[PDB]
Structure formats: structure tokens, C-alpha cells
Design a protein around this ligand. Structure first.
Ligand code: HEM
Ligand code: HEM
Ligand code: HEM
Ligand code: HEM
Ligand code: HEM
Ligand code: HEM
Ligand code: HEM
Ligand code: HEM
Ligand code: HEM
Ligand code: HEM
Ligand SMILES: O=S([O-])[O-]
Ligand SMILES: O=S([O-])[O-]
Ligand SMILES: [Ca+2]
Ligand SMILES: [Ca+2]
Ligand SMILES: [Y+2]
Ligand SMILES: [Y+2]
Ligand SMILES: [Y+2]
Ligand SMILES: [Y+2]
Ligand SMILES: [Y+2]
Lengths: 471, 471
């Protein structure tokens, strides 16, 4: 039993847990150190063509420290510029994996109500970032999954629920509350007062299993599309950080090595063992993260990972180049008057190509977590994309355009022009929101006592569209 | 110093070494146990289209035990049906990696003379299979490379020579005398008696380095082709078992684990350590071959290898399907009258596609030795093949044939018809050779005392074209 056996008042605010766990609080806060913004649309402008007609063609950066998750949610152009709790492009579900205020609100209002409405609905309530309460019971301090969709997905794919799993299983599943692929399943429901509502509910596409191909069958069976492509009008699927599913999968996952083993390694101090809560890049910390199970140099091992990264880049760039070309060639065929029936098989190829390639690259550690599956997926994706292009040559031929050359998209600017993204307009609208409604959120939350301004230190210094310089 | 410090009379005949090393002799002979013939043209008839116009479109089986190497050389349809020492399709170099009689003849007649003439030249001389004298000095019993091309290649690629290497390096290099990619470099020379000769000399394509792409540049720079494709008339490159180069490469090679560690593991008996000379499949022997360095089950580890194999199959089948189609589409474009200039870029793509995919699959353990490089290569190959096909669609369009569908090649029979291989004729001609000149070889060698008929026990019971049933 703990020094807080009856619970913690203000549990959602990680700082409340500091009185019991100063060591874990101090390392947890250090993810403030991972403050770099890598604009992935800038590195990989092919992704803009890929995501044409979708919010990720606006703004898409690489992950940084958990210290930034809530602010990044607010900052991304993907969440747009709500003017109140009923406006803005995105639903309430976008909060789900960013805040210990999520379980707080779910446990107070119910899952369906939580998943009902606009992201802006909870702006002055969902104010704390990735916190102790996302992973830990506030009485026992035991690892807990705080989100019901995870057990739902687990069961569906035949795994044990969180409660049913081993401790070593749990040390990965806590991560898997967030670090998995999801879709929003539009859900009709009735409240306590009898009103008709519609919830958009986080759903793990795991009921045929956790492989890319099994999820592909899942989505195909239900004829699901995340968006209709802005250039090719293909019914598209978006992969988002299938980190756990692919880790599963890979030799370390197979061997039973948990996420926490590399990302939260132990420091022994006599009778007391302590987990590093500074979740970051394990290569920054190889003695503790790797060298319990690996003999031989840090350096050789860092070089082996670099080599994996470069193999992944190689196949990634190929796949997304042919994916991009295929979308563009398809838009061209459309302009020339080619029919839906004439393009249906092409579009199915593009949908599958991109599903597989996105599933490979959407988890930023997968190139390491499951290198062979990653390469196999990117190679499989590219093959679908190439089959699309061979068929496209013929369709273009049929309409007099066999010599058509898809435009280039080697810069983010050129790519966003093709995708018809008025980023400037979006940034302007965004800043206005940050300057007005965002500050009203943070002011109100601080007044209500839901937010401690200590947690805002350097959290809002950078985004893909500004950089004050300091974070 | 050894019990044979002055050398061994009849060193080429491994049985001569038995008086000193009964334990190693007994396990060495046990590779007679690996007697299965897997006709790879039957499993993978796409390889017939790939090798159209080349001997491997006749006969190509998977490796079996070293006990069979010399007889398989004699049996393969690739060596055809010489009627004497000046006939038959293939040169003397085909003996090089099959027999301890090779170093014997090189050391007696010189490298250039050895490499001068037809394979049939040495039929009654090269009569012992893979023997102690291929790897061991007959005075010290120390590991030795017996072939000068290996050090030549080693130096060229910047590695230490055999003599310069560590013992653990040597325990892989002994294998690398044979288990590497090679080409025959036509070489003009003058003998002792002043006559003009031409040697076809085994050359490691390693002077730009040992990567697939480095060898590709090697061959491109010299405008080298192994054959001109029988269907597409592409200048082709043949990969042959780049086992060492790819192992190099892979995590085990990187970590310094030698071929001998898995393939020739140790048995400790007090003061005495003994290497298993039965070179075979290490999964048959996992306690000794794997479980010194791996904790956890044999079974999980066997399952992990199976999974690698199936990923390799998946990308292999894709690549060789598009390679096959590309050759066929190219032959079709030729029939319609397309020009060399119109096909040059296509052909370059096909040459590179197949070079890379063949380099991936030509070493039968590479899917395990270097799984990530294997997948990356097959994915790279397929991409070249797909680029070829997109360009081909246009060339076919230009000649009225945009709707052309390449024939299928899903059986060896169908594939050999397309490749114009009269296998029946070849088999008939072969049997005649085995029934006459082959038996004269073996009779004469046994008379001269170069061959002990004990070594022929069950060695000639099977091939791709007969099976007496017993081996
Ligand atoms: C111990 C289990 C977890 C592991 C191993 C893990 C791993 C990581 C890593 C390595 C990063 C990037 C950090 C960096 O750039 O150095 C990251 C970022 C992120 N993680 Fe986790 N994580 C875990 C738990 C969670 C949970 C439970 C959630 C959801 C509540 C979550 C949501 C996020 C988000 C939203 C980001 C991006 C943050 C940003 O860019 O601002 N993670 N995680
Ligand atoms: C559409 C609603 C959502 C929005 C607008 C949103 C926003 C973001 C942003 C801005 C990032 C930082 C990197 C980037 O710029 O992309 C991020 C990363 C992340 N998000 Fe979300 N999020 C949404 C839904 C979700 C959900 C439902 C989950 C969990 C089931 C989740 C989990 C994560 C995780 C684990 C990362 C870090 C790993 C990575 O980025 O690859 N997010 N999200
Ligand atoms: C400041 C907030 C946090 C506090 C006060 C806290 C507290 C603790 C404590 C007391 C332990 C046990 C001792 C130890 O291993 O150090 C622990 C371990 C652990 N925590 Fe946290 N934690 C926090 C944040 C988080 C979050 C957000 C996650 C999930 C993403 C998480 C996941 C884990 C994991 C996986 C272990 C390993 C436990 C084991 O080995 O069984 N922690 N934490
Ligand atoms: C399912 C459990 C795991 C999760 C959720 C997880 C999460 C992640 C994330 C989000 C990243 C991207 C970091 C970034 O670029 O922002 C990453 C990378 C990485 N992870 Fe994991 N990881 C898990 C398991 C593991 C394990 C078991 C290991 C070691 C065996 C490991 C080691 C690494 C390494 C070496 C990288 C690349 C370095 C980096 O980019 O940070 N991870 N992981
Ligand atoms: C970020 C730190 C780590 C790095 C960079 C790393 C690196 C590697 C690499 C490159 C492999 C080869 C597998 C492949 O091709 O993907 C491997 C295998 C393996 N690693 Fe890790 N690893 C790390 C952490 C760990 C930890 C914490 C454990 C133990 C709990 C572990 C145990 C293993 C095991 C058991 C294998 C399978 C090979 C074997 O049986 O020894 N690793 N690791
Ligand atoms: C210790 C170093 C070596 C290793 C690890 C090795 C490995 C192997 C393996 C695993 C096989 C297939 C056996 C089976 O089917 O179970 C094989 C076959 C073969 N090896 Fe080696 N080998 C080595 C040395 C050599 C040498 C020095 C030569 C050349 C003189 C050679 C030439 C061959 C040939 C020609 C075959 C195919 C034989 C046939 O199908 O009849 N190997 N080797
Ligand atoms: C063109 C001349 C040659 C011929 C006719 C020939 C014949 C054969 C045959 C019949 C096999 C058994 C498997 C099969 O049916 O393909 C084989 C395998 C093998 N040969 Fe050759 N050989 C030649 C040149 C070479 C050379 C020069 C080397 C060494 C530098 C070599 C090394 C090997 C090795 C290591 C294998 C077993 C590995 C594998 O087959 O993938 N061979 N060869
Ligand atoms: C019947 C013929 C052979 C005999 C009598 C023989 C003899 C021996 C002896 C006495 C040893 C040292 C003790 C031991 O480790 O068992 C040895 C080891 C070894 N032999 Fe052989 N050998 C034969 C065939 C071969 C062949 C054809 C190869 C090459 C393909 C080969 C490669 C090796 C290797 C790699 C070792 C390991 C030595 C070490 O660990 O340093 N042997 N052999
Ligand atoms: C360059 C050194 C090596 C050579 C020349 C070599 C040779 C080969 C050959 C020719 C095969 C194909 C067997 C067949 O299907 O006929 C093979 C497969 C295999 N080798 Fe190696 N090998 C080497 C290194 C290693 C090492 C270091 C390991 C273990 C770490 C290993 C383990 C295996 C395994 C598990 C297979 C697949 C099982 C099989 O098909 O026999 N090899 N090797
Ligand atoms: C045929 C028997 C063996 C099998 C089936 C096997 C299997 C594996 C596998 C699957 C990996 C993961 C790397 C990958 O993805 O390719 C690995 C890594 C590794 N193996 Fe092996 N292996 C064998 C023999 C050996 C031996 C004899 C040694 C030691 C001399 C060894 C030492 C290692 C090392 C050092 C790693 C790197 C991961 C680590 O650092 O632990 N293996 N092995
Ligand atoms: O948008 S979040 O799922 O990465
Ligand atoms: O023909 S031999 O090089 O496998
Ligand atoms: Ca999704
Ligand atoms: Ca070659
Ligand atoms: Y308190
Ligand atoms: Y990062
Ligand atoms: Y004797
Ligand atoms: Y075999
Ligand atoms: Y691997």
C-alpha cells in the first residue's frame, strides 16, 4: 500500500504526484528536453501529395517530448482555428492521447459524451499534458490502462485484456493506450436526458488481427475511407503511429522485450529500483537502454541502427515517389474524362499501396522496432503503386496523353501547391485563434484550478510555423 | 607440429587424412546425408524466363551436401555432354569449387593452364569431391585458402589477405574460396613452350567493394555481360551464391560470428575440442549451432527463421514476376520492330533489376544471413523491373500493342517453352555422356589411383532428371 491509499486530489495534474514520487516526477518532466520540431512535410514533401485533401497535408511534424503533446495538439494546423466550443474542423477525440484530463473527463461524463462534439468543446478542461494519471492508478500506483478502447481492441484481436496480462506485458500496454493505429467510428447514442447524439469514437482496427494486411481487410470490409483523395479521388486510409502493433511483430517484441525496457530503463540503488521517466530516444542512453542485453560497443550498435534507418529511407522514398506519381496521373486521367469505372482498380491499388507504405513509416521507431516488416511493407506498397501506374499508362493512352509527365513535388511548397493547400491562410487563422481563444482557455483553466502555469514553461515556443527559439 | 609434418601422400583424396583425423573424417563424410535434390526451376519457374539463353534455364537445383558437389557438377545439364577433352559447352573453371583435385592441378600446372580449356579437359583428373585439402595445409593442418583468386579479390576490396586475417576471419574465409560471386575473365597468356593460349579465369567482382551495387558498377564499367538474354536480348549479369559477401553485411557477420560457428560448431570433450565437419542446415542442430549465444527456445528461434524465409519468398515472387514480364514484353516489342535505341534504357533497367534480385536469392541462406539486405535488394530489383515495364507500355503502345499480355510461366514446362529449351534433347545427350565418357573418366581415374571407388557410394543416384531412389 502507498502513501496515497485513498487517492490523490487533483490527480490529473501530474505535479500533485510529486509529493510522493519526486524522482519519477523529475525525470518525467525532463521530456521537456526533447523540444525539436522536425517538419516532416519539409523533409518528405511527397507526403503532402499523399495526404492531399486531408489535414496532414497542412502540418505534420515528427514526435517530440511528452512535455509537448498537449501544446502540439493545440498548435498543429490540423486542429485549425475554432472560434468557440462548437467550431473548428476536428472532433473531441483528438484530445484522447494528449492528456491525463481525458480519463478525468471520461470517468466524470462517460465515454460517449467525451467522444461527442468538437475538439474545441474541452479546450478549458483538457489542459494537462501526458501525465502520471495516464498510466498509474492514483491509489495503488499500479500500471493501468485508462482508456476503454484499448481492451476493446485487445479482445477483438484475441489478446488478453490489460488486467489479464503479465506485468511485462503491461509495461508495453501502457504505451499502447496511445501508440497504436486508430480510426474514428461514428456512433449514434442517447444521453441521460434522452437527446439524440453522435459520438466519433476512437476504435482500434484490430478485429481481424494486428497485421497491416489484417487491418487492411478490416477497413475494406466496412468500406471505410478516412478521406477521399484531393487529387485522385481515391478512398484513402490514414495510418497513424502503429508503434505497438509493429513492435509486436519485431524481434524485440517477439522476445518479450517491453517498450519500457528501452524507453524507461532501470537504475538500481541498493534495495531501490527506479525507472527513468524521461521517455525519449534510447540511443541517447545506451548504457542503460541497451547494454544489459547487448555485449560489444555502443558505437557498432548505433551504426547498425543508422544502417536500418537508411534502408528504410531508401524504400520509403521510392514508394512515396510512385504513390505521388500515381495520384497525379490519376487526377490527370480525371481531367481528360476518364470514368470511375475505368479508375476503380487503379484507385484500389493506390489505396492499398499507401495504406501499406504509411503503416510502415507512420511509426517513427518502426524502422528499428520491426525492420524486416517495415521493408517488406514499403516494398509491398511500392508494388501496389507500380501496378497502379502501369494501368494508368493505358488509361492516359486511351485519352491521348500517354506522354504525360506527373509534376514534381520535391519541395513542400511545390507539393502544397499541387495539393491546393493555402498554408499562409491557415497559419494566419491559426495565430488569431492562439492569440484569442487559446489564451482564454488557459486563463480559465488556471482560474478554475485545472492548470498550473508552472507546466507552461517553454511549452509554446515552437511549431512548424513559428519558432521563438528557446523551448 | 602434427603426425604428418612432411605432408600427406595422396593429399587430394580426403580418405588419406583419415589415419590422422578419424573424427573429422567421419563427420565430413556425413554430408552424404544431405542428398535431397530440389529442382529450383520446378519450384520457381520464373527463373527459367529470367535465365533464358543461359545454361541455368536448363538445370538449376538447390545446394545439397558437399559429398555431392563433384557429381552434381558432372550431372547438371549445364555442363552438357562432352564427347572428349575438347568438347562440351563449359570451361575448365567449372571444376574450381568442386574438388580438392583443383589445388592439386593448379600447384602442378599453374593457375593459367588450369584455367585454359574445356571442363572436359580434366574429367579423369578432377575426381574427388570437397575435401580436407580444399581447406587444410597437409603439413600443419592449419586453415588455408587454396585458390589465388580469393586473396586477389580480398585485396581489391581492401580487406586483409587470408594470411593477414585473424583466426576467426579464417573460419569464414575458407568457405569464401567457393561461396562467393565470381565471373570468368577471359585472359590471354603464353606458356613455357611459347604457344598462345586463352584462359577463362575465376575473378571476384570485388574491386569497387562487396556490395551488390558496387559489383554492379564493377560490371557496368567494363561493359560485362554473362549472356545476352534469349528473349529480351538484354546484356545480362548472373549472380552466383554471393554467400560470403552478403553474410558480411548481416548482423552475424557484423558481430564477427563466422560461418564455422553455425555450420561447424564445436563439441567439447575434456581437453579436446572437435569441430563438426558435417556442413549442413544449422537448424538440424540448434543446441550446438545456436544455443551458445541464444537463450530461449529452439522453437521460437526456428519460427523466427521461417518468418524471414516467407518474407523473402513474398518479395522474390513479386520481383521475378515483373522481371519475367519485362523480358517477355521486351521480346514482344522486338517482334513489333522496336529498335535497340528505343529499348536501351528498358534493357538497362532489366539488367539492374535482375542483377539485384538474383544477388538477393542466389545465396540460399542469405534470407537468414542478411535478411534486411535481402529484402532491400528484392524491393530495389522489383523497382527497376517496374520502371522497365512502365517504359515498355509506351513502346508497345507505339507499335499498336498496348493491350499485350505477357504469357504466363507458372510451370517449368511453360517457362522452358518460352525460353526455347529443348530439355528432353539435353537430357538424352547428357545420359549418353554419363553412360560412356563419364564412366571412362571414373574407370581411368580409379586405375591411375586418383579415385577410390569407396567415395562413389550412392553419389550418383539422383539429379533433376533421374532418381534411382536411394543416395
Ligand atoms: C511507456 C510507454 C510510452 C512510450 C515508450 C512512449 C514513447 C514515446 C517516444 C519515444 C516519443 C518521442 C519522444 C522524443 O521525441 O524524444 C513519444 C511521443 C509522444 N507520445 Fe508516447 N510513449 C509512451 C506513452 C504514451 C502515452 C500513454 C501517450 C498518450 C497519453 C503517449 C503519447 C505521445 C504523444 C501524443 C507524443 C508526441 C508528443 C509531441 O510531439 O508533442 N505516449 N512517445
Ligand atoms: C484527429 C485527432 C488528433 C489530432 C489533431 C492529434 C494531433 C497530434 C499531433 C499534433 C502530434 C505531434 C506530431 C505531429 O505534428 O503530427 C501527434 C502525435 C501523436 N498522437 Fe495524435 N492527434 C489526434 C489523435 C490521436 C489519437 C486518438 C491518438 C491515440 C489513440 C493519438 C496519439 C498520438 C501519438 C502516440 C503521437 C506520437 C507518435 C507519432 O506522432 O508518430 N493521437 N498527434
Ligand atoms: C510524474 C508522473 C509519474 C509518476 C509520479 C510515476 C510514478 C511511478 C512509480 C512510483 C513507479 C514505480 C517505481 C519505478 O519504477 O520508478 C513507476 C514506474 C513506471 N511508470 Fe510511472 N509515473 C509517472 C508517469 C508515467 C507515465 C505517463 C507512464 C506511461 C506512459 C508511466 C509508466 C510507467 C512504467 C511503464 C513503469 C515501470 C513499472 C515496472 O517496471 O513495473 N509513468 N512510475
Ligand atoms: C511498443 C513499445 C514501444 C513504443 C510505444 C516505442 C515508441 C517509440 C517511438 C514513438 C519512437 C520514435 C522516436 C522519435 O523519433 O520521436 C521510437 C524509437 C526508437 N525506439 Fe521505441 N518504442 C517501443 C519499444 C522499443 C523497444 C523494445 C526498444 C529497444 C529494444 C526501442 C528502442 C527504440 C530505438 C532504438 C528508437 C530509434 C531512436 C529514436 O528515434 O528515438 N523501442 N520508439
Ligand atoms: C535501444 C537499445 C537497443 C538496441 C539499439 C538494440 C539493438 C539490437 C539489434 C540491432 C538486434 C538485431 C535484431 C534486428 O535486426 O532488429 C537486437 C536483437 C536482440 N536484442 Fe536488442 N537492442 C536494444 C535493447 C535491448 C534490450 C533492453 C534487450 C533485453 C531485454 C534486448 C535484447 C535483444 C534480444 C534478446 C535480441 C535477439 C537476438 C538474441 O537472441 O540475442 N535488446 N538488438
Ligand atoms: C566451412 C566453410 C563452408 C561452409 C559453411 C559451407 C556451407 C555449405 C552449405 C550449408 C551447403 C549446403 C549443404 C546442405 O544442403 O545441407 C554447401 C554446399 C556446397 N558447397 Fe559449401 N561450405 C563451405 C565450404 C565450401 C568450399 C571450400 C567449397 C568449394 C571447394 C564449397 C562448395 C560447395 C558446393 C559446390 C555446394 C553444393 C554441393 C552440391 O549441391 O552437390 N563449400 N556449402
Ligand atoms: C560455370 C562453371 C560451374 C558449373 C557448371 C558449376 C556447377 C554447379 C552445380 C551443378 C551446383 C549445384 C546446384 C545447382 O544445381 O546449381 C553448384 C553449386 C555451387 N557452386 Fe558451382 N559450378 C561452376 C562454377 C563455380 C565456381 C567458379 C565456384 C566458386 C568460385 C562455384 C561454387 C559453387 C558453390 C559455393 C555452390 C553451392 C551454393 C549454391 O549452389 O548456391 N561454382 N555449382
Ligand atoms: C576429411 C577431411 C578433413 C579433415 C581430416 C579435417 C581436419 C580438421 C582438424 C584436425 C581440425 C582441428 C580440430 C577440430 O576443430 O576438429 C579441423 C577444423 C576445421 N576445419 Fe577441417 N578437416 C577436413 C575438412 C574440412 C573442409 C573441407 C573444410 C572447409 C570447407 C574444413 C574447415 C575447417 C574449419 C573452418 C575448422 C575450424 C578450425 C578452428 O576452429 O580454428 N575442414 N579440421
Ligand atoms: C559466410 C559464412 C557462411 C556461409 C558460406 C554459409 C553458407 C550457407 C549456405 C550455402 C546455406 C544454404 C543451405 C541450403 O539451403 O542448402 C546456408 C544457410 C543457413 N545458414 Fe549459413 N553460412 C554462413 C554463415 C552462417 C552463420 C554465421 C550462421 C548463423 C549465425 C548461419 C546459419 C544458417 C542458417 C540458419 C541457414 C538456413 C538453414 C539452411 O537452409 O540450411 N550461416 N548457409
Ligand atoms: C543457426 C543458429 C542461429 C540462429 C537461428 C540465430 C538467430 C538469430 C536471429 C534471428 C537474430 C536476430 C537478427 C536478425 O534479425 O537477423 C540473431 C542475432 C544475433 N545472434 Fe544469432 N543465431 C544463430 C547463431 C548464433 C551464434 C553461433 C552466435 C554467436 C557467436 C550468435 C550471436 C548473435 C548475436 C551476437 C546477435 C545480435 C543480437 C545480440 O547482440 O545479441 N548467433 N540471431
Ligand atoms: O494525429 S495523431 O494520431 O498522430
Ligand atoms: O554454378 S555454380 O557457381 O553455382
Ligand atoms: Ca488510421
Ligand atoms: Ca556472376
Ligand atoms: Y496535493
Ligand atoms: Y523526437
Ligand atoms: Y596414406
Ligand atoms: Y540443401
Ligand atoms: Y533483423
Amino acid at each position: 500500500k502507498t502513501a496515497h491509499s485513498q487517492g490523490i486530489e487533483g490527480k490529473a495534474m501530474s505535479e500533485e504526484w510529486a509529493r510522493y514520487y519526486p524522482r519519477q516526477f523529475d525525470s518525467w518532466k525532463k521530456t521537456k528536453e526533447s523540444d525539436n520540431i522536425t517538419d516532416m512535410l519539409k523533409e518528405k514533401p511527397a507526403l503532402v501529395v499523399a495526404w492531399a485533401g486531408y489535414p496532414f497535408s497542412k502540418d505534420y511534424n515528427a514526435p517530440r517530448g511528452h512535455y509537448y503533446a498537449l501544446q502540439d495538439n493545440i498548435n498543429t494546423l490540423r486542429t485549425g482555428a475554432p472560434v468557440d466550443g462548437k467550431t473548428g474542423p476536428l472532433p473531441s477525440a483528438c484530445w484522447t492521447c494528449k492528456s491525463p484530463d481525458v480519463p478525468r473527463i471520461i470517468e466524470q461524463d462517460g465515454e460517449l459524451e467525451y467522444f461527442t462534439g468538437k475538439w474545441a468543446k474541452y479546450g478549458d478542461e483538457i489542459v494537462n499534458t501526458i501525465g502520471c494519471y495516464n498510466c498509474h492508478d492514483d491509489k495503488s500506483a499500479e500500471l493501468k490502462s485508462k482508456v476503454p478502447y484499448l481492451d476493446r481492441g485487445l479482445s477483438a484481436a484475441g489478446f488478453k485484456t490489460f488486467a489479464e496480462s503479465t506485468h511485462q506485458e503491461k509495461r508495453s500496454l501502457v504505451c499502447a493506450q496511445c501508440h497504436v493505429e486508430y480510426y474514428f467510428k461514428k456512433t449514434e447514442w442517447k444521453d441521460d436526458k434522452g437527446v439524440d447524439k453522435t459520438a466519433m469514437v476512437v476504435t482500434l482496427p484490430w478485429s481481424k488481427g494486428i497485421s497491416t494486411e489484417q487491418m487492411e481487410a478490416y477497413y475494406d470490409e466496412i468500406n471505410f475511407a478516412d478521406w477521399t483523395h484531393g487529387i485522385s479521388k481515391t478512398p484513402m486510409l490514414k495510418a497513424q503511429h502503429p508503434d505497438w502493433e509493429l513492435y509486436k511483430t519485431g524481434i524485440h517484441g517477439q522476445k518479450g522485450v517491453s517498450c519500457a525496457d528501452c524507453h524507461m530503463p532501470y537504475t538500481q540503488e541498493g534495495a531501490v529500483k527506479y525507472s527513468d521517466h524521461k521517455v525519449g530516444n534510447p540511443l541517447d542512453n545506451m548504457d542503460k537502454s541497451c547494454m544489459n542485453c547487448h555485449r560489444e560497443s555502443e558505437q557498432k550498435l548505433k551504426d547498425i541502427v543508422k544502417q536500418k534507418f537508411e534502408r528504410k529511407e531508401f524504400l520509403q522514398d521510392i514508394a512515396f515517389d510512385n504513390i505521388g506519381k500515381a495520384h497525379l496521373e490519376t487526377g490527370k486521367a480525371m481531367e481528360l474524362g476518364a470514368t470511375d469505372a475505368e479508375l476503380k482498380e487503379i484507385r484500389t491499388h493506390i489505396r492499398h499501396a499507401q495504406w501499406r507504405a504509411d503503416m510502415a513509416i507512420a511509426g517513427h521507431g518502426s524502422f528499428f522496432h520491426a525492420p524486416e516488416e517495415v521493408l517488406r511493407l514499403l516494398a509491398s506498397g511500392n508494388e501496389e503503386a507500380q501496378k497502379a501506374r502501369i494501368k494508368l499508362v493505358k488509361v492516359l493512352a486511351k485519352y491521348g496523353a500517354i506522354d504525360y509527365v506527373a509534376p514534381d513535388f520535391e519541395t513542400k511548397e511545390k507539393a502544397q501547391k499541387l495539393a491546393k493547400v493555402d498554408m499562409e491562410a491557415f497559419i494566419a487563422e491559426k495565430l488569431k485563434f492562439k492569440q484569442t481563444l487559446e489564451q482564454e482557455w488557459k486563463k480559465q483553466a488556471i482560474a478554475k484550478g485545472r492548470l498550473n502555469p508552472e507546466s507552461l514553461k517553454g511549452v509554446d515556443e515552437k511549431s512548424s510555423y513559428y519558432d521563438k527559439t528557446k523551448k
